[PDB]
């Protein structure tokens, strides 16, 4: 189990954790909140 969790810290932790998190965050923000061109001030 230690080898699997240490395998999960090379390339997935940076290319599928952060990428999926950041992409999903920006996409869900643009999905619930439609297209933002100003600070709505």
Partner 1 sequence: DIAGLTPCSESKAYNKLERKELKVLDKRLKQYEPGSAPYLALQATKERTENRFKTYAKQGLLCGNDGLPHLISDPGLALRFNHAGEVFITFGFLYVAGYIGHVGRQYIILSKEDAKPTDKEIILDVPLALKLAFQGWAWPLASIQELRNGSLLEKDENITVS
Partner 2 sequence: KVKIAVDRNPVETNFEKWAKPGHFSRALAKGPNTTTWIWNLHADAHDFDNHTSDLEEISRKVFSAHFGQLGIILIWLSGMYFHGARFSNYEGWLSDPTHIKPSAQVVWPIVGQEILNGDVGGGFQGIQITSGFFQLWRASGITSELQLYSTAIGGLVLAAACFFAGWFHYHKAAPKLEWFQNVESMLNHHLAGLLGLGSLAWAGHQIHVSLPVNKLLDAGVDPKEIPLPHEFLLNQSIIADLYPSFSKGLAPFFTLNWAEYSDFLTFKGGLNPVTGGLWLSDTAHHHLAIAVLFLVAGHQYRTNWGIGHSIKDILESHKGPFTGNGHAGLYEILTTSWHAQLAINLALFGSLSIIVAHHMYAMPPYPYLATDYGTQLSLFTHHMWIGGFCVVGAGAHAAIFMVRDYDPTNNYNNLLDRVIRHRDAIISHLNWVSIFLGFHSFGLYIHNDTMSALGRPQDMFSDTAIQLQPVFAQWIQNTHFTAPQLTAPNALAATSLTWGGDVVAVGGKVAMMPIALGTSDFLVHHIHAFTIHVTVLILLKGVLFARSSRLIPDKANLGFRFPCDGPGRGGTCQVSAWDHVFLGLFWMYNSLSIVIFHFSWKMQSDVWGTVTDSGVSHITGGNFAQSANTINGWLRDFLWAQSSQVIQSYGSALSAYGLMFLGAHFVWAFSLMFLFSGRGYWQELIESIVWAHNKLRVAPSIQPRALSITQGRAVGVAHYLLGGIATTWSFFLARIIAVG
Measure the CA–CA gap between 27 and 41, rounded to whole angstroms: 23
Binding-site member from 3, 37, 38, 40 for partner 2 (CB under 8 A): 3
Residues 19-38 as x/- pattern, contact with ligand CLA by CB under 6 A: ----------x-----xxx-
- Please name the residue that has the structure tokens 């230690």: 2
How many residues appear in the chain?
A: 41
**Tokens found for residue 11:** 């390339």
C-beta of 7 vs 13, nearer to ligand CLA: 13
Residues that bind partner 2 (CB under 8 A): 3-4, 6-7, 10, 27, 30-31, 35
């Amino acid at each position: 189990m230690k080898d699997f969790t240490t395998y999960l810290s090379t390339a997935p932790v940076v290319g599928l954790g952060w990428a999926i998190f950041t992409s999903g965050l920006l996409i869900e923000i643009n999905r619930f909140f439609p297209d933002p061109l100003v600070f709505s001030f």
